[model samples]
Target: LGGYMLGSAMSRPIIHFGSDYEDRYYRENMHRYPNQVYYRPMDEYSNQNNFVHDCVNITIKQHTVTTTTKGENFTETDVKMMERVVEQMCITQYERESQAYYQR
Candidate 1:
């Protein structure tokens, strides 16, 4: 691609089954973040029903995800930027698709 000058190194972020930009992306975001979880008893939701509703315990776990980060290479920077752009593009691109979603 004329826009790139990496000498045919390939442009895919996750190269070689997680060796390049994708690796960094994961390390910077996925591995760098914290783990979160929520434990709630069914009675919590049943508080409104009380004697009218059965009681039970529930645990909600949310394992968040991450995206690319800015690395020394311009390509890495592009990786960071593209995620933002692509995300917005998707939002606009999918005005109606039953369900296409994402997060930042």
Candidate 2:
């Protein structure tokens, strides 16, 4: 593992999960981002639809340990920890958004 350095620890942006259909790769899972070091990805495909549809709902939280390994071990749990912190940040944003929507 090459020596990696950390200069600053700053707040991370809220990750926004979205859809990407008809993409060039045509991957199997419906989740936009998969196998990432950070937040757990979602693959909410509709059951018995036989069409490109995803069910929508809200209420979330889970606990899974962090890991990172591949050709070069440049990543580690520390990276995932940082990512994990950012993962929680996303929910905070969602909460704010929910309040705004319900305020009406």
By lDDT, the best candidate is 2
At residue 36, what lDDT does model 2 achieve? 21
Q: Write the per-residue lDDT of candidate 1 for residues 1-104, one digit (tens) a residue.
A: 12211111112233222357655654455323221112222223322232111111010001111222323233544344344332332222222221332231
Where model 1 places Cα greater than 4 Å from the true spot, the runs are 1-74, 96-104
* Number of colliding residue pairs in each model: 1, 0
TM-score of 1: 0.22
Best by TM-score: 2
Cα shift from native, residue 84, model 1 (Å): 0.6
TM-score of each: 0.22, 0.29
Q: Rate the local accuracy (lDDT) of all candidates.
A: 0.27, 0.28
Stretches of candidate 2 above 4 Å error? 1-74
